[PDB]
Ligand binder design. Sequence first.
Ligand SMILES: CCCCCCCCCCCCCCCCCC(=O)OCC(COC(=O)CCCCCCCCCCCCCCCCC)OC(=O)CCCCCCCCCCCCCCCCC
Ligand code: HEA
Ligand SMILES: CCCCC/C=C\C/C=C\C/C=C/C/C=C\CCCC(=O)O[C@H](COC(=O)CCCCCCCCCCCCCCCCC)COP(=O)(O)OCCN
Ligand SMILES: CCCCCC/C=C/CCCCCCCCCC(=O)O[C@H](COC(=O)CCCCCCCCCCCCCCC)COP(=O)(O)OC[C@@H](O)CO
Ligand SMILES: CCCCCCCCCCO[C@@H]1O[C@H](CO)[C@@H](O[C@H]2O[C@H](CO)[C@@H](O)[C@H](O)[C@@H]2O)[C@@H](O)[C@H]1O
Ligand code: CUA
Ligand SMILES: [Cu+2]
Ligand SMILES: [Mg+2]
Ligand code: NA
Ligand SMILES: [Zn+2]
Lengths: 43, 259, 514, 73, 144, 58, 98, 49, 227, 79, 46, 84, 105
Amino acid sequence: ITAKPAKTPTSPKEQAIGLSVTFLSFLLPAGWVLYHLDNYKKS
Amino acid sequence: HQTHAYHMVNPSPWPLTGALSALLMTSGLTMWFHFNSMTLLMIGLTTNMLTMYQWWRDVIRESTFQGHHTPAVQKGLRYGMILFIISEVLFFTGFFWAFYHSSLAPTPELGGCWPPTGIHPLNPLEVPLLNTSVLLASGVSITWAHHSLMEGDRKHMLQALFITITLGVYFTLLQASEYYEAPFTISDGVYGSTFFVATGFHGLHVIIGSTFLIVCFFRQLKFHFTSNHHFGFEAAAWYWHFVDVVWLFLYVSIYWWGS
Amino acid sequence: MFINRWLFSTNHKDIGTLYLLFGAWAGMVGTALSLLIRAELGQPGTLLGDDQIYNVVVTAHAFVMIFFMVMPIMIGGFGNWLVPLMIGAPDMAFPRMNNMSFWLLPPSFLLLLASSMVEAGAGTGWTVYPPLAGNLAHAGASVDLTIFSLHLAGVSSILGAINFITTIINMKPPAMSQYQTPLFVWSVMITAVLLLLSLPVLAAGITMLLTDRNLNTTFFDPAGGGDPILYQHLFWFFGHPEVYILILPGFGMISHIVTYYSGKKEPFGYMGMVWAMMSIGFLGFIVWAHHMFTVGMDVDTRAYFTSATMIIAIPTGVKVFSWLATLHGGNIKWSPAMMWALGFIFLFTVGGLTGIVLANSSLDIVLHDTYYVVAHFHYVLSMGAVFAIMGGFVHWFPLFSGYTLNDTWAKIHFAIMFVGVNMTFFPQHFLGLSGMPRRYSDYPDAYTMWNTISSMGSFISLTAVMLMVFIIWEAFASKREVLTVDLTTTNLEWLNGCPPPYHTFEEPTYVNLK
Amino acid sequence: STALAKPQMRGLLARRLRFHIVGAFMVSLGFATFYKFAVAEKRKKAYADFYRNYDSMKDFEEMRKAGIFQSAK
Amino acid sequence: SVVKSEDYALPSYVDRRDYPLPDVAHVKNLSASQKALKEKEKASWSSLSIDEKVELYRLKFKESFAEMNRSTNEWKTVVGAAMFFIGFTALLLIWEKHYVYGPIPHTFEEEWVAKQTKRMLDMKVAPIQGFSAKWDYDKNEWKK
Amino acid sequence: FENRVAEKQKLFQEDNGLPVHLKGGATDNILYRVTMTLCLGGTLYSLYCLGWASFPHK
Amino acid sequence: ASGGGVPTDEEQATGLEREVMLAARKGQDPYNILAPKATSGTKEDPNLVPSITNKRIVGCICEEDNSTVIWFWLHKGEAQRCPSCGTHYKLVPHQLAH
Amino acid sequence: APDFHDKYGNAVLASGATFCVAVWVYMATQIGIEWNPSPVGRVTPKEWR
Amino acid sequence: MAYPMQLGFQDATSPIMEELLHFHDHTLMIVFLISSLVLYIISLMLTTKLTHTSTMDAQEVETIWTILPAIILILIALPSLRILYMMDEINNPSLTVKTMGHQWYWSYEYTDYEDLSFDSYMIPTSELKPGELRLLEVDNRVVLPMEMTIRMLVSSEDVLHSWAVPSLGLKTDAIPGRLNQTTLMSSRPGLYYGQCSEICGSNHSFMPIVLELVPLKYFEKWSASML
Amino acid sequence: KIKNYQTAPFDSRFPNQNQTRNCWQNYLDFHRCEKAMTAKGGDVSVCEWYRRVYKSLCPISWVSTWDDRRAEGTFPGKI
Amino acid sequence: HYEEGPGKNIPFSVENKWRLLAMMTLFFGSGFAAPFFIVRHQLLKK
Amino acid sequence: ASAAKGDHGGTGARTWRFLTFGLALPSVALCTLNSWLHSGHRERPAFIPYHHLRIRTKPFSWGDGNHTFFHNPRVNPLPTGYEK
Amino acid sequence: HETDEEFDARWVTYFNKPDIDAWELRKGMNTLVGYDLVPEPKIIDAALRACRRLNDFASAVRILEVVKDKAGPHKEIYPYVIQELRPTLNELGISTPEELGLDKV
Ligand SMILES: CCCCCCCCCCCCCCCCCC(=O)OCC(COC(=O)CCCCCCCCCCCCCCCCC)OC(=O)CCCCCCCCCCCCCCCCC
Ligand code: HEA
Ligand SMILES: CCCCC/C=C\C/C=C\C/C=C/C/C=C\CCCC(=O)O[C@H](COC(=O)CCCCCCCCCCCCCCCCC)COP(=O)(O)OCCN
Ligand SMILES: CCCCCC/C=C/CCCCCCCCCC(=O)O[C@H](COC(=O)CCCCCCCCCCCCCCC)COP(=O)(O)OC[C@@H](O)CO
Ligand SMILES: CCCCCCCCCCO[C@@H]1O[C@H](CO)[C@@H](O[C@H]2O[C@H](CO)[C@@H](O)[C@H](O)[C@@H]2O)[C@@H](O)[C@H]1O
Ligand code: CUA
Ligand SMILES: [Cu+2]
Ligand SMILES: [Mg+2]
Ligand code: NA
Ligand SMILES: [Zn+2]
């Protein structure tokens, strides 16, 4: 396939930001629940 | 401007209202069976009925009034109704399978016999034979209706279709009376379970098919059908023959062989 | 405008977009349930301290992945986007019904989430066998809410199957016979005929479970003369067609992706590939009791089910060999979609082969209800389906969005996923042969090492899933618009540009007879 | 200078295919042979040799004296 | 030379080893020297210089076979980055061991295992191949 | 009865840009608003009921 | 025994369904219901492809029973050839509803 | 003209492999995970009754 | 029982189980060969610059690739069905024992002569004696005579369960209202473990089976003492 | 008199894995016979074989529910 | 008519990449987080 | 079979009306007489509380929980027997 | 199908057509390189002469590159073919891709 160059290039720094927020968005809420399992298990 | 013959449908809200009426009907049966309340179920049955009415009203606007059913569109609808009726045949097949599984190898809790000890089956030569004659009769009159329509005879299409609907209603009243009179119930083990769930779902399809022929009757009274284009009447007749065929298998299997 | 377009749609591409988004969000729910399973198992002892919860999470993981992730993506998503374009049709036969099959899914999913939130959930297995799923061992609304969730999902799919069969049979150019239609459109036709005939039997079975739980029927209760084994027959009569329905549209996509990236105008042995899919769909109706070899079955019936099940290897082998003969002589482009298809071909073959071991009822006595069955279906089903899905998605994403992905990042995603799934499932074979049961929340200590490695594998596929969400973001963030695409002469869905206009084939294609 | 001799120019992909499919067959035969001796016969012989002079009462008596049984002390 | 979205329905240029003569020339608008070069091409090609020959090739084609077929270092970035994210997953599993999992059962203690192991060899677990088969009951030691 | 389909054909083919489900007039809008009110209000009520049923009432 | 009162399509068919019926009567196919029949497809006797715009997709089934169909845009102007079999096609644009 | 892979590929390979090996070795050996390997050749059996 | 890092089947305790081990070795050889052939052909398809992209004729090759797989299946089916019918053949047992599943423990009935029955529950981890196996031991084992054909009948008093002993090649679902029959014969004395193998609710993982195989005269005396 | 019972032998009437009907048939035969004997003033001793067979095969809870339902008058087989 | 074209044939905006990052985070993160929270809810009921 | 009648020159509206009134509806009339002639209440059987009948594993969602939906007091006993 | 000799003659005749057009030259070469063979010198000779009649130097060079590419790892085949065409290359003033530096990456 061929394509145009990006209309809104996403630089390495912007990719690190997108990847980090994507990762925290799945890791943090599950991490919180699992960290506190014992507070639930005997709550 | 298209230059094929198929129908691009206007954006419509009926799919969403029909999906939500499904969530309310099922949420509502849950509420009725567990939280002692009929509220959600009644709102869902009401939305279901409004959805069906507006959706099929709009198919009639599209075809009779707007002219969107070209022969290609109509052939697609023929396939859709045949594949629907095959799906309903497979649904009844699950119920016949449960029937033969239970009655061909009756367990010791039953007395090891069929019909179970303590079950007194209806006599298949009484009302069940009558109901058989009534549905077969209505298969002959709906065929009279169809030929009168193809032959351009308005009054005799109306009379034959009325007679067919009157027979469907008579079968429904008969079956209601049989259910009241029956000495066994749905809680009478697997005899009651197979008998009432399999004939009850058949009865429900008799009510749906009768309602469909009643819609065709009012469409014919308003001149919607032409002598050559009348697919809603064909679909209603194929469905009504389905209902008759399912009844013949119920009568032979459950009422006659299983007695 | 927004509501008319996205809630009242009658357009096959938008509705297909909706199903891709739905299925992607389902796949996150499913993946999180799978990570909970493997966290409970990742070391000996109890994590959740409540095995009724562990059974609910296992039951939900399978229904979400099967009914809310695979079927919506493959048939609702790729089916609706691609089948009309591949046959030059202006939309599906029933464009407004098509929108009800999509909208029944969010309510069906809400009912399943309701089932897990009320009472103590339905901790039944996705087979929902009575009497555990009955009203004494699972009293309360949860199993009924699961039964309704499956009813709404069945009706969505039976109506989708009527629409796809009619569209495919009625809406091709007048010169194009069925034997001029692409293999993906055949794989969809055949999946739809399986849906049409199998779903109504599962609706009969689960409606009888519903009446046994609420109306005092006794189809499956021996006290009234019922039989729990009758449920298993009606469940599996649907359930074996269901597994071929999960893979058939994956086989269709794979034939297109391997043809395309081998630079070929056509798959090898097209009519052999049509025959093989029809044969697998036909034999898929006469094998189901291989799911029941330990219920107390007569020896001649075990013999018949063992032999009929194995026969499926013949047509499936013709398709594996034909994909290899399609790569043969190709100018191979090693694009990320090609990697996903070649991973499919190898990992699907492994799983199909462990299926053939299980078809031998004498070995199945020892292997039934152990992790060897779980390893089987996570290779052929979880990996074969998911890898055909990922290969489809990376292949066709520039068609549906108009934008390109970063191919390097997509290769990276492939590599990480390939390591993860193999680390997670491959040791489950050893667990199975050495006798670890499925559906357990903890195991005898001897099974620790393989469980520990399988749970570490599951985290590797999680890192892949997170990465994939970033990869889609980056493509939409960067906005590299497509310019040119090769082999449009044998890939009609790309010839209207990327994305194609809302209405395509308003003027139909011209195809002569001659 | 020396002219170059004419090489085989036709069917080179097919030729390569036939060579390696034959090769893969030979290797398959090799492996079947290795496997029947490293695994399958190995197993038959382990079982056969174990049971050849096996004395089940003696094994039971050793188990009983080690204290393993509920029904035998 | 610029390719536009609105050109999708027209034949386009591709460099593919298996489609060596594409449907259009790489350069469609020529300079006046390029045009005269095309005129010169209609006379004996022995009169064209090497540079003119190269230029006629480059007006017709974008990349040569050697160029389009070249290998790249992308595999290093792919394999490296896949290793980096696999390494990151181990950070997740260190966090889960530290913060989520409690103690394993006491049956994994060294002394329990030693006793349990004796009791497996007392009951001759897997005596033919798998486990007791590897113990020497005469010498009272694992078989060498 | 008399055949008045041609009147209806004129009505529903009027070039007024209305989608078919509202092209019969004001009565269509009212029926549409009843149906959608009941569906959306019922759906909010079923979410309330799940909220209620999600917790033990002892 | 027999009477009338049911409309005929001649009387009551409307919209596109009426257009297709009236066109079929004149033996025409403005809505592409039929498969066109091939010409010899040479440069002198090209397949003639009607369009209401300036380009139309053609699928060419190069030999009877091929399962592979070859697809390409055919543009107004000089005749174009199938990229597989070389058969010629020429676009004949315009019109429909008068 | 160097792309990303020509300029960064060797670094990405080298550090990604080093990092991956280091952190998995540490996770496998330093944090108390019980792999439960075979007793064969490793455990001295001890009286239990 | 299984042992740490095990890859294959538990060693065989009954001659049916040894048959299955040899049949599995034969089938696994065929599975490795095919999977390794497909992986090899894939690598071969992908490792040449030579091309051939024109239409290829498929009927010659589809013969080999339907007949060869059919022969391999018949070569699995033949030993496979031999075992199946062999296990099924008339045995004459010397003893019948019934087991009933419950949520979540098993009971056993040995009522050929006297009325003997008892319940058998998992030993909780905190109550295990040194060296005993977590999740596997029970309070009351199923003591049985070694070297004798026994008929086990299996049922349930509540939901489904399944009664399994992998070293003996046994797994028979336990279904309320049904009496499923299987035969068991141990070549050796010892302790053989298994675990419930049909999901039956929150303690499915915690209702194991332990057989204790001993000479007949010990079995007679143990039976007498359990009355 | 014709004894040395060890367990119920193979019965070609019930050759397969589900033995429910074997248990049930021998329970019915026992009680039918015992009924025949007790009535016609003969001796229950001749009914022994069916007694031994259904004792060996039938779950105790089945036998005990079926004895209760005979006492209750709700046993569904014919004796 | 409706908007056509890249970025316009979808029910979410891609006009700003950071606002898109937030919408995608909430969309996929809410699917992923749900089962953790449903297990918390069932452990908290007893 | 051919039935025992004849027509086939044409199966049109006239023929199917002839079958409707000449065979189908006379059949229904005969069966209606046969039924409404073996009608008349038959003597209800002695109640026996068999455990495979009158099953109650959950109360019904209507009435007192213990009556079936088309409960007929004359012929449908409850688990504890016929109603007063 | 046909003998090697027949196949080669058919392709010689295709490219030797005096008024072959540019569409036909491309169709020919792009069809021919789909086959499992490196085309014989005589076939390549005729296609390079079609290039001459069509005034197309660039396509003649690219035809030489594709002969090399079709030989894959059989490195003796391309020099043999160039050897064989040398009288033609000389007569028509066709420089090889190597002589033009187009083999360097
Ligand atoms: C993830 C950790 C794994 C730990 C490994 C073993 C530990 C050794 C202990 C220590 C070794 C000491 C010797 C003790 C011998 C025990 C004998 C026995 O009773 O034997 C029974 C055993 C025999 O098992 C073995 O003899 C181990 C061999 C493993 C199979 C070969 C593939 C190697 C896979 C690579 C690693 C896994 C992930 C990739 C696998 C990719 C998918 C298959 O159990 C099986 O039945 C497992 C196979 C399941 C069947 C699926 C087969 C499909 C083929 C797989 C692809 C092959 C072609 C590609 C060729 C391979 C190219 C990739
Ligand atoms: C994508 C979904 C999918 C697919 C396609 C398959 C395909 C097959 N599966 Fe199944 N299967 C599952 C999903 C799938 N399965 C699931 C979900 C379960 C568990 C359900 C539950 O309990 O939850 C399951 C369970 C299951 C069982 C029950 C095991 C048990 O519960 O004890 C069995 C038994 O026979 C079985 C067999 C097979 C076979 C023989 C195939 C065949 O179709 C495979 C054919 C493929 C090949 C053989 C490989 C390709 C072929 C060649 C390279 C040619 C040469 C090969 C030979 C000569 C052998 N599968
Ligand atoms: C004259 C024939 C007309 C039939 C219809 C009449 C009644 C109410 C409406 C619904 C019809 C539904 C069809 C069948 C469903 C189940 C049982 C119904 C058949 C019936 O009516 O059976 C009655 C029992 O009804 C009962 O429980 C009634 C319980 C009513 C609640 C129905 C429960 C809803 C459950 C249905 C779920 C449907 C799932 C559908 C799947 C769709 C596919 C996805 C029998 O009466 P009885 O007093 O036991 O015995 C007679 C003694 N004198
Ligand atoms: C107490 C009463 C409530 C009972 C509960 C359930 C409700 C009853 C529903 C009864 C079904 C009514 C269907 C009416 C359809 C009217 C629309 C119609 O018939 O539409 C026709 C197209 O057919 C078409 O769509 C064919 C469309 C066919 C629809 C078939 C529907 C069957 C529905 C079953 C639903 C339940 C499932 C069963 C449960 C297990 C329009 O084309 P023509 O007729 O050719 O007219 C055009 C000519 O005039 C031109 O000259
Ligand atoms: C299967 C998917 C799961 C994958 C593994 C998840 C990886 C974990 C990512 C981190 O998650 C967080 O980590 C914490 C600690 O590291 C938490 O803070 C807790 O820990 C503290 C420090 O001990 C306190 O500062 C806080 O109150 C807090 O609740 C917490 O809330 C949480 O969001
Ligand atoms: Cu009992 Cu699982
Ligand atoms: Cu199956
Ligand atoms: Mg099971
Ligand atoms: Na655990
Ligand atoms: Zn062509």
